[PDB]
């Protein structure tokens, strides 16, 4: 054949010889991801092996949107899709999908382990915010933002990653509200309410905060202690919000201890923030203010994406082209609630993976 193989742990990659000398760099959920050199390209690239392309009726729905979205969404702040293929010859044989994307130096966790200066931290946050926006402009939510899904480059550019849980609007409180990474779940998700665009904005808070403190904001020993860590921090949400909770959740939420919460001045004392200058927009004050507008329990009151891109701490970087870009366009083929059969799927994964390279 043309492809080949290499021993990458308890698994094996069967790729086009054009991608040489592999090495693992990520133990994710949608599959392992290797960093390699694309000879033909003359630039090192990232390759994701899709684990059981259609094992459960669930792994499909995601592995699909990943593909689709990987395609229909292009923005300078969102990991570009380089290639996709499959070492298999035909349907009956098909059972593996490989994804090739650009390749960044590292993951945000890396930044979180270092001090930034306003300029940096604000630019990144900016970039991060542009990426999301572009997605939102299509009603497309990411639902799972976190360091792990954000990558940087020696030249300080930011690129968003992963689209498994990516989906639209949000019919309700999904089915498995566990799928999103704990530490970054937004109240609407924890209390199973039903999300809007800004659900991502909450995650953005958890991130920036972490980037500021250098440790996870709202830890949480389990799916439920999560809510606890949140309220112990921002204080019990007000009745208006309670009234919005399902009847069962409501009860429990109200039966908890009544936490007041701490002022953001104490949650993020000026020190923790990159050393202020004299400049006004790039100031701890301002940076701290954004946070307070994102780390909000009642989503209806949480700064929308644009409002963020316009806020004084991110404002200094604004540029129509990046922010107000044109909305990406997904056909209408991709559904986030549709439901087919293990097999029925197997087909759409081919007839797509196919006409993609």
């Amino acid at each position: 054949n043309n492809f080949y193989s290499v021993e990458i742990g308890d698994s094996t990659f069967t790729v086009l010889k054009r991608y040489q000398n592999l090495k693992p760099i990520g133990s994710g959920a949608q599959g392992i991801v290797c960093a390699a050199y694309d000879a033909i390209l003359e630039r090192n690239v990232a390759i994701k092996k899709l684990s059981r392309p259609f094992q459960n009726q669930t792994h499909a729905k995601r592995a699909y949107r990943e593909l689709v979205l990987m395609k229909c969404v292009n923005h300078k702040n969102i990991i570009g899709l380089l290639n996709v293929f499959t070492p298999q010859k035909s349907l009956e044989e098909f059972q593996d999908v490989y994804i090739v994307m650009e390749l960044m130096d590292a993951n945000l966790c890396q930044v979180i382990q270092m001090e930034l200066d306003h300029e940096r931290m604000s630019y990144l946050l900016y970039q991060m915010l542009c990426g999301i926006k572009h997605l939102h402009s299509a009603g497309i939510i990411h639902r799972d933002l976190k360091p792990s899904n954000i990558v940087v480059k020696s030249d300080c550019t930011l690129k968003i990653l992963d689209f498994g849980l990516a989906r639209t609007a949000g019919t309700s409180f999904m089915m498995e509200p566990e799928v999103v990474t704990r530490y970054y779940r937004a109240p609407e998700v924890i209390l199973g309410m039903g999300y809007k665009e800004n659900v991502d904005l909450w995650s953005v808070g958890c991130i920036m905060g972490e980037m500021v403190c250098h440790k996870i904001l709202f830890p949480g020993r389990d799916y439920i202690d999560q809510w606890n860590k949140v309220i112990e921090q921002l204080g019990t949400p007000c009745p208006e919000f309670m009234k919005k909770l399902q009847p069962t959740v409501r009860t429990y939420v109200e039966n908890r201890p009544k936490y007041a919460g701490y002022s953001f001045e104490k949650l993020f004392p000026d020190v923790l923030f990159p050393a202020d200058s004299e400049h006004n927009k790039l100031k701890a004050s301002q940076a701290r203010d954004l946070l307070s507008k994102m780390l909000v329990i009642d989503a209806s009151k949480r700064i929308s994406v644009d409002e963020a891109l316009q806020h004084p701490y991110i404002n200094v970087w604004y540029d129509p082209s990046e922010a107000e870009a044109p909305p990406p366009k997904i056909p209408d083929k991709q559904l986030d609630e549709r439901e087919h059969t293990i097999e029925e799927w197997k087909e759409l994964i081919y007839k797509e993976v196919m006409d993609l390279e």
Binding site: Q110, M114, E119, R120, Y123, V152, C156, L282, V316
Partner: peptide, 10 residues
């Protein structure tokens, strides 16, 4: 104000 171009990742 101008955009940052370097980022130490070590």
């Amino acid at each position: 104000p101008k955009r940052p171009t370097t980022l130490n990742l070590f």
